[PDB]
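Supplementary material to the annual report.
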Amino acid sequence: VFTFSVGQHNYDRGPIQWMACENKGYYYEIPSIGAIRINTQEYLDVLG
Amino acid sequence: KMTEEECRGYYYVYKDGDPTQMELRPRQWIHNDFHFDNVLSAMMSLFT
Amino acid sequence: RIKPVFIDDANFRRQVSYQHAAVHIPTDIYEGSTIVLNELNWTSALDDVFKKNREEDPSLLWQVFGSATGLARYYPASPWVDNSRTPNKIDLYDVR
Amino acid sequence: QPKPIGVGIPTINLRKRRPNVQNPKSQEPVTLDFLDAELENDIKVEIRN
Amino acid sequence: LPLFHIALLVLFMVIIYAIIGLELFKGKMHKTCYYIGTDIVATVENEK
Ligand SMILES: *[C@@H]1O[C@H](CO)[C@@H](O[C@@H]2O[C@H](CO)[C@@H](O[C@@H]3O[C@H](CO)[C@@H](O)[C@H](O)[C@@H]3O)[C@H](O)[C@H]2NC(C)=O)[C@H](O)[C@H]1NC(C)=O
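Predicted assembly:
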């Protein structure tokens, strides 16, 4: 399970991090357009 | 880029928020015009 | 930096240099970082194997190392199709 | 052929295109099926399988 | 209660100036410089 927190907000991000690194996954944050390309390609490191 | 050493090189700027409309700008570590670094700058900021 | 000669070649409709390998770094990735400079330090040993492979089989086309840090070192050296901002156009190429 | 594989019908909105943006061109591979390169036939499907 | 006359004067001045502006600048701020053949307003980095 890979979880992505997108945008700027005041909502709690703890539960999605727990989902990420509980089911052998990873947690990513995408605050703007500039981070989309870098953060949507890093999941191949965990898969390798 | 959260540090002066990271804030180097160039980055993409998306005008009107469109991911397909790109423009290149250099990264520069900027300092606020009104700050609180010393007592004089703090006094100027508080006067403003 | 390095200034190559860039002779004209067949099997490459471009100008290539067989003396070293070219390095492509994504535009938004700052070259000169500790991560990037370290990669360029130890990837300089691939040029000898590039030359050995080319001399063993002269029909080889591009052979490239795609780094996990975004770098791309390919042989033979050749100017990139799209400069950063020399023309009005830019490039969006990440080896990853 | 060296041309990229076309998908759908191309639609453009020329009223929302700045002249100095360098929009991305393409990154997809040229994946053409055997049945899409010739006239598809029942025997040809069997041969391909 | 004593501020009643002042409020009346304020409303009176506001009405007069609104009517004057209506007759002077009606339908005048409706042209801006778009790009060639597009519906995109042309501005610079820090200009509204
Ligand atoms: C990455 O960069 C480092 C530093 O430039 C390279 O290390 C350098 O390797 C050369 C080749 O062995 C060293 O030259 C030798 O130095 C010894 C004395 O240390 C001398 O006795 C030999 O005759 C020869 O001149 C050089 O000193 C060394 N530099 C440092 C600072 O240790 C390294 O080779 C680079 N990586 C790759 C893959 O090329």
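The radius of gyration of chain A is 11 Å.
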